[model samples]
Target: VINTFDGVADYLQTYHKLPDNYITKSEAQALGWVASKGNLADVAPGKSIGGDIFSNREGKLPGKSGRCWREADINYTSGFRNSDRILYSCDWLIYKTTDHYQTFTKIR
Candidate 1:
């Protein structure tokens, strides 16, 4: 069942700068969506601070130069080296207490 709301779209537009569009391809990746906590679309100036989701490993890699959201602090630091690629894992670290989740999905 779909619940309807009046000013949610307006709120997103004004504060989050999200584009208004059809639900043909829409999904709310949310744990909670409360205005006082901040809109799901906005975050700190550079951090992916809006939600529980984490950025991809490729973005954190120095050689994978096409990432759009490359952290400015790391990109400029001397510690950012190609040799550090092996230090980072593209997959999650599985442990007794935590579940390691794959980052990619297959449609086929």
Candidate 2:
């Protein structure tokens, strides 16, 4: 809602999770989301695909018992979903990637 990365991170920290504006991929899909079309706003209305479970099967992320991660699209202001994303696990472990999921940089 703050339209900034740190703002979103701060929001997550305060809410203990993603903001209400974020929705699951399934939810978006249910609303007629198709990556090819990329018209999320027309169906979901101010909703962005976030808080979606991401299986780190590539072993790129640190794992532990009861540890899982959620992903949020970054710089997804309008039109189609962007490649940029922020993945977070546990309470505050956040990672960022510009080239989709190719690589990640840990943040906080």
Candidate 3:
């Protein structure tokens, strides 16, 4: 579910929430996921890394009064995790970061 830019963004815009396919970082780790090992498929077959609160520490993304950010992998099509990630706020604002977190582009 949280795989493509448009798909994730559309779902967020409509539902104002993440899909059920997402699991928190701790949950993924509990399932035997290793970020650099490309072991997600080997662990949780149909799950993606998501539902974890993003600190927004760099302050690269826009700020809103109640925009608590959450992150998910996007366009993930291979071994280890790529740089692509989708960020969604509690307010339902969504954005994409293709170069890890160095930059971001708003989607919805």
Candidate 4:
């Protein structure tokens, strides 16, 4: 599955969209996924949590008048998830933050 930043970003860049394995938080939650417990594997199996709108409350990522961002976990395999995540805009702007959103670098 396209779970890594490199793999996910590459898929996004190539297809201009998220991979098939990606699922929104609401969808995951409906399927019995509790992020705090990291029980995605138990409930959703091969699916990856993603496609949720990023509020950009920190104002860290570059923004435009009509642009918004979406976030997804990076390198998330099992157990507890890490801070690393990839934030991407529908307009094709992609950023990766490894330090829990402290800093971000563009990847697409």
TM-score for each model: 0.16, 0.88, 0.87, 0.89
Local distance difference test scores for all models: 0.22, 0.78, 0.80, 0.84
Rate residue 45 of model 1 by lDDT.
19
How far off is residue 26 in model 3, in Å? 0.6
- Sort the candidates on TM-score, descending order: 4, 2, 3, 1
Best-to-worst order by lDDT is 4, 3, 2, 1
Local error of candidate 4 at residue 79 (angstroms): 1.5
Candidate 4: TM-score? 0.89
Measured by TM-score, the strongest candidate is 4
lDDT of candidate model 3 versus the reference:
0.80
The sequence of per-residue lDDT tens digits that candidate 2 reaches over residues 28-69 is: 888898878888888877777888788888878777334478
* lDDT (Cα, tens digit) per residue for candidate 3, span 30-66: 9888988998877888777777778887788887544
Task: Give candidate 3 regions above 4 Å deviation.
Answer: 65-67
Model 4 C-alpha lDDT per residue in residues 1-108, reported as the tens digit of each score:
889889998888888888888788899889998878989888987777777888887788887444468888888777666898899887878899999889999887
TM-score of predicted structure 1? 0.16
Winner of 1 and 3 under lDDT: 3
